[PDB]
Design a protein around this ligand. Structure first.
Ligand SMILES: C#Cc1n[nH]c2c(-c3cn([C@@H](C)c4ccccc4)c(=O)[nH]c3=O)cc(F)cc12
Length: 284
């Protein structure tokens, strides 16, 4: 579609400014690989970036959706949302996503690493930052669908940036199940498991699970509940139990995130207000 080609031009980065270090692999996933990259500005200043390949994107429909997603995400400008520097649509090679490099990697690996010692307050602070980034994304009507601690990055100042190192995004929820690479079952809202649909309210459910990952320092949720038994576990009214070091008011926030009625779950704006009040009770 020629109009889509013209609209996406401002998102495109090419060999005139980007060098992909294809032998410097940062990470490998089902979507493809993540490589170190260097972007040069007009004064020759170097910008360290991460370059994610989206191997699934090959046919004209997928490529059009990729261009649409790049236009949408190029507009992102919020301290707790990972910016999209640009995209590369090479004549030869799979499409590439150009992101700012994140010095401290993903939030899950960070809190799980035994050499790190984040306090309960630092963990609540990371949750508050994620809630702010999700309040921004929700205001843009952007439904994440894969919010989890593994998908939130930490920059050189320990600022949390909501990001996505999962499968290439789909425009429609009906394409999501087909495209999956396991579904993030243990982060999904009850209605997404049953009806295959995703909304900002199902992102709120995932945020509650992400808060649980933070308070357990990256423990796998429902380790003892098989993926195929999660839907029934949630129907029996059962939930993730309160982590040992999770304050009661923050566990109450998690319970509201997992309300069986999506319309009754708090909004991200309410979560920012509530978690800010809880965070303010911790000294340090
Ligand atoms: C089709 C398709 C795509 N699938 N994913 C894409 C991306 C991508 C974006 N971002 C950041 C801008 C982000 C994402 C979601 C929420 C907050 C911040 C990532 O972190 N990873 C990505 O792969 C960029 C893009 F131009 C196209 C696609």
């Amino acid at each position: 579609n020629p109009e889509l080609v013209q609209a996406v031009q401002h998102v495109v980065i090419g060999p005139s400014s980007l060098i992909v270090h294809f032998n410097e692999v940062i990470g490998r996933g089902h979507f493809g690989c993540v490589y170190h990259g260097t972007l040069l500005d007009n004064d020759g200043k170097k910008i360290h970036c991460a370059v994610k390949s989206l191997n699934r994107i090959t046919d004209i429909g997928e490529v059009s959706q990729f261009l649409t997603e790049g236009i949408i995400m190029k507009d992102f400008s919020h301290p707790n949302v990972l910016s999209l520097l640009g995209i590369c649509l090479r004549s030869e090679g799979s499409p590439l996503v150009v992101l700012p490099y994140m010095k401290h990697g993903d939030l899950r690996n960070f809190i799980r690493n035994e050499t790190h010692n984040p306090t309960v307050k630092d963990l609540i602070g990371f949750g508050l930052q994620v809630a702010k980034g999700m309040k921004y994304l929700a205001s843009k009507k952007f439904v994440h669908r894969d919010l989890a601690a593994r998908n939130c990055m930490l920059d050189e100042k320990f600022t949390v940036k909501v990001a996505d190192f999962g499968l290439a995004r789909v425009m429609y929820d009906k394409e999501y199940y087909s495209v999956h690479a396991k579904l993030p079952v243990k982060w999904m809202a009850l209605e997404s498991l049953q009806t295959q649909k995703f909304t900002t309210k199902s992102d709120v459910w995932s945020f509650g699970v992400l808060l649980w990952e933070l308070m357990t320092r990256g423990a796998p949720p429902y380790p003892d509940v098989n993926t195929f038994d999660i839907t029934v576990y949630l129907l029996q009214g059962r939930r993730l139990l309160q982590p040992e070091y999770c304050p009661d008011p923050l566990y109450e926030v998690m319970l509201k995130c997992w309300h069986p009625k999506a319309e009754m779950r708090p909004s991200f704006s309410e979560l920012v207000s509530r978690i800010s009040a809880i965070f303010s009770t911790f000294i340090g």
